[PDB]
Amino acid sequence: STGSATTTPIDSLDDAYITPVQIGTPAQTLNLDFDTGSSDLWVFSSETTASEVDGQTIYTPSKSTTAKLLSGATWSISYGDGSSSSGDVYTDTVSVGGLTVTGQAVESAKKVSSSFTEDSTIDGLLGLAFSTLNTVSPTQQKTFFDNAKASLDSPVFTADLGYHAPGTYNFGFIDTTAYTGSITYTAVSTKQGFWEWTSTGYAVGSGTFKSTSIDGIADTGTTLLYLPATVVSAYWAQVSGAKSSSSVGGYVFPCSATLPSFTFGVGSARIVIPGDYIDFGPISTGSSSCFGGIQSSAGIGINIFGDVALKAAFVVFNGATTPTLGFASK
Template structure:
């Protein structure tokens, strides 16, 4: 899911993925770039996340499958984060010859869409030009996306070769934007590549890039590992398709079943604590590289805030003490294992003498989103074939 947050002068969108194949495959390198001009509004961003997830009703996570298939091989791809871990995006090539785009990788959605020359309002972005690609094939179907703040994007479908770091996915369905509202103009990305399951594509029946990487034999194991670095620890990061990188985590990987019935990487959080103080039990969550912060239900968020002495701004965000020395870690329990967000990650941003918490809520949401505040503290291997994840503390925790 593409979800951004801003507190005062900052934008908090984060998503990223760069990948590398398992042994026998080619190396996929997706170097990430940054843009400091991206500053959306916090209220609009909260509306976007509520609207996007409300499109697909989220049910309690029942009858989740267990286990995780063993991976074959690893791959290393360096990435760069934007300022204080605000946004990650990588270069994806589309067409023959290649046209390069800054693409947001998002485990909370499943579409691949990009600005195109059919769009007269997309001039701030690099636009895909179908007339310059010998592998372009028209589709004719239409697509559209609407966000809660009124911003929209729409266009037509096509297929073309999509290249991720040297691996060419043939006949990949892409969504070409013909229209986008003015609110997208300041967004640094040219498009978005979803890493969720194919049941939530905007147009039904479309195979995702991950589907095609697997079916076309471009990777030998249906997994991708995600390591997001912290700006406070020299930033960077690493993303892999087809394997995991044991140098990016400590301790033992713990398996957590995933419920993909709603199309997301859904998990059950059996317990949430601030230190030893319980603030939530048995709730549904989504692992989402496209969300910067931790987004809880209003009830849980206010309990978390109370435990940290934070003040509700009334818009879903919280003011929190700038002194974290007495903070306790935020502890998630999933499938019997605990995973931490340490005290130094509870403060997300400081604006003068005011600090903003790294957790928030969106009124009316019935689920929680474990965004990059969780993911940059915990290394996660996503397994698409056996819906599950493996999690271990990140080396940056």
């Protein structure tokens, strides 16, 4: 089997991407944030505290003839940005882009934190990291990809995120028309539960490439590119007037600036992030200070190749017995 679904930016900045997902029978379509940095499929639901729902579409398990309470199971997750959610668990049929999994754990939110309530466009998350990070207790549950893997033509999914445009998540096949040149594959460590890999270096604009190992994760659920402070300082030093602002929470730059590109290495290959992908616009409406899309990881504990990086590439998440990542230009 295979599946193919369009993923669409939630706003004009590409702050996140939503993909329609069919849950239950008859189908209830919810727009979920596919997140290669977590491993829970959780949704706003008929069980979510009413004051914490503000415009999201909800899953109502009692209206699904295939829903079954997973007795005794609870979940609770806290994300790297400080947000969180928790609840109970049903199993139900879940389909993405024509690919159907029966018996998928659908984690129904009883509580969500403010940032989720305040985003009416995201009806939940679909985690695509390794199932060892799934938070369901006392019986850990498998991700959608893990459940689908054996049925797929090839044990892979691909992320082709658009810049200010829709893109595609494919499951079970690699669309050879979706990228240019060749895909370069690189080793993955699953020891932390992430799609963790080592970039071979970077360049700023037309500058020389610096060969250096940068360990990080490929994370579709993180908006920006978080890298070591040395790298980030080298980038923003090429933008006149750019500075790190403690009050804003990162590097800002004059909105009148033209940003240089940023290149990262994948083995001997190179992925170029155009400067325009690094512009996240005014820090507040009407401001002439703009927020940068490359930020320091120094306070995170891990480097994160988020959407800013991933949207410059066609990315293969190879879930073979020994997983690998592939990157191609496009």
